[PDB]
Design a protein around this ligand. Structure first.
Ligand SMILES: Cc1ncc(COP(=O)(O)O)c(CN[C@@H](CO)C(=O)O)c1O
Lengths: 414, 415
């Protein structure tokens, strides 16, 4: 309890060693998982603070425990900054995760058995948007909408489904969709059947904050997000809501589905929001969008296909059929070449769900460590090299060596 | 640069947050903390959840992840699982729950369907929010039957048995947020078995005492045992589920993909560190002092004319009946807080006051024991509390106590 003696290395050598290896792994691999980023030392320092010691059930100025004057300052800063970031009427920064943020809306507005609409998992929707093995799909009646022939969201079909099934709530947002979503149109659809509109902007949140992806907040009743993806913050969730839903949302998070908030993580959220308000962050996201486009363009030049035909965001779904390789095989081969991606089903995938014909790629992480258009293009070409000969030892090695050059030249943490 | 560890300090990036954390650091030093659910976790634990492991998406379980590159977070999580199994002798464990509430929700999601009947200890008598409160998920989406204390303010096992037979709960919850005595988990297991119900024990408050062997272990008797890692266990903020091997698959499926997504791997690393610390002989010695200090505190307050619910404590915690000094729980909390003693108000059985007022305060010894308080200090603290309670609005009294608190806090620094 002098920070000198209680180090991880002294107290728990096994865990220290494992953490050290993860540090090096983060340096030594090019990360293209669209949901991952590298958060700042300041953010990490914040959730490594003594604020973990405080029980603070309730909300600023209305706590159940005494001694909360300073954690109140922290939480209110987090609330005010995130409201400022997205122009929200109200906010809740206590959700433990993106899942809990989404569960909070559901607990606030719905009863078990209610009908909801969400984007289908097969076409890029998330687990929490109605999967039958998730709470959202097991305890509720789920109707899903998907993509059209152009692999854009099929707004007409969604409208038809809404009228047919009369959902109490409509979910929009996605984990693997490259285009701009028309939140205004989904809002009209929701209003026309008297449904709530909830937008899960977890993946796009950083882009939205920087103004390079459309903002769902003026159109939706509820907007949920993670703080750790494109927002580049700590791991956790946030709910944004219209003022009229402030009381049900706050009551749903506590005492509804959570207990004591993680005040150290909320402090870390506040720091990330401060960073997101800066001109440097806007410039970062402009580069994120640029690098994603260049990556997509490069893969197309090498004969691959991009689902929806283009990206208008940080993310892309790559159709691998022209190179006669499965997503599963592609993920494995790229991983061996020190490029981290994940397999992902494409629309009308001829392969089994655990195999797939696609991979999802994203630019936030590589952009954070300093990659520009030249590097994004180089990475595109390296991926294609692997895909065209995934089991050739010499091919994997040549790429790995070039990956090593990039990662050494662009360190994550200095 | 934004990712240079020299330049990216909290003070450099965010001076306002720096200032608030600094004030909180000093607040933790300058107050005697007697909130029974709070502790001071080690720098090693804090360092772990301040690590780069926050950057990793690791949906799934060790060796069965959906993402690549999880080799090292797998080592971390498996160490956490193996150590917590070792601490409590559990057949299986899940260390991903984001909180105690999510731990409890995980069991419910695994074993129950909305509308099912459950039994839990009543909130009025020391049960927790997640044990069937109608404003909590546990009580709003399920049919709740609650059991409480008897005339001696011990758990009324006979009444619980009658209720179980009458209502046929699918699941019985045991454990408490404010109960001083040893709970008879074996008897509750028998009652549960007799009606074919699952037994879930929420040992959040007692977990550290149980690990050190100074409070009875529910693991050999229960189907499921849930806990927080931040209370008497003295770890990071988060949850854990312990379960019999036969329930390994439904429990793991319930946490993911059931109710959570990517686990907080940095926090799980911190959990692992906390479990390593808990396995040491020093931790057992700590919990012996916790139990001793709680007893001494209780005895001292009784000497000053207060009453302890259940008549004694056999743990870290006590509920103090304040009526003899004609002061409410709310007023007591406020007055003690001004004297730099942190407590929280709490209803007593058959409390004549409104729920927001109460006639009691809950006290615990884990935090003060952690910063080094012994029996002499525990007794002194008991007397200081009584001094405030007997004259809660006297400025001179508040000042004298505050001065003595300052002497103690200076003598026993936390960090
Ligand atoms: C759109 C969206 N919404 C919620 C979540 C879950 O948040 P957690 O903090 O992990 O609970 C996600 C998470 N996405 C992961 C896994 O599906 C991803 O790689 O996209 C999400 O995308």
């Amino acid at each position: 309890f002098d920070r000198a003696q209680s180090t991880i290395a002294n107290v728990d050598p096994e865990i220290f060693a494992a953490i050290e290896q993860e540090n090096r792994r983060q340096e030594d691999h090019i990360e293209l998982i669209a949901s991952e980023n590298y958060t700042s030392p300041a953010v990490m320092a914040a959730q490594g603070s003594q604020l973990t010691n405080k029980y603070a059930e309730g909300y600023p100025g209305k706590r159940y425990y005494g001694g909360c004057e300073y954690v109140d300052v922290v939480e209110q800063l987090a609330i005010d900054r995130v409201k400022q970031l997205f122009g929200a009427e109200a906010a809740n920064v206590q959700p433990n995760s993106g899942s809990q943020a989404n569960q909070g809306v559901f607990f606030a507005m719905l009863k078990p058995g209610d009908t909801i609409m969400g984007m289908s998992l097969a076409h890029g929707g998330h687990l929490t948007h109605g999967s039958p093995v998730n709470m959202s799909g097991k305890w509720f009646n789920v109707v899903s909408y998907g993509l059209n022939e152009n692999e854009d969201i099929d707004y007409d079909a969604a409208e038809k489904l809404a009228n047919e099934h009369k959902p109490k709530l409509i979910v929009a947002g996605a984990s693997a969709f490259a285009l701009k979503i028309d939140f205004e149109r989904l809002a009209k659809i929701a209003k026309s059947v008297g449904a709530y509109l909830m937008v899960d902007m977890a993946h796009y949140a950083g882009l939205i904050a920087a103004g390079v992806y459309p903002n769902p907040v003026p159109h939706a009743d509820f907007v949920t997000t993670t703080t750790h993806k494109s927002l580049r913050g700590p791991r956790g969730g946030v709910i944004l809501m219209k003022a009229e839903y402030e009381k049900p949302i706050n009551s749903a998070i506590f005492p509804g589905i959570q207990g004591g908030p993680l005040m150290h993580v909320i402090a870390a959220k506040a720091v990330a929001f401060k960073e997101a308000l800066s001109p440097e962050f806007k410039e970062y996201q402009q580069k994120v969008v640029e690098n994603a486009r260049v990556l997509a363009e490069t893969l197309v030049k090498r004969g691959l296909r991009i689902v929806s035909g283009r990206t208008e965001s940080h993310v892309m779904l790559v159709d691998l059929r022209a190179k006669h390789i499965t997503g599963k095989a592609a993920e494995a081969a790229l991983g061996a070449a020190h490029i981290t991606v994940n397999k992902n089903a494409i629309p009308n995938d001829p392969e089994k769900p655990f195999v797939t014909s696609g991979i999802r790629l994203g630019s936030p992480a590589m952009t954070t460590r300093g990659f520009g258009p030249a590097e994004a293009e180089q990475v595109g070409n390296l991926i294609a090299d692997v895909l065209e000969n995934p089991e050739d030892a010499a091919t994997i090695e040549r790429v790995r060596a070039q990956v090593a050059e990039l990662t050494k030249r662009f360190p994550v943490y200095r």
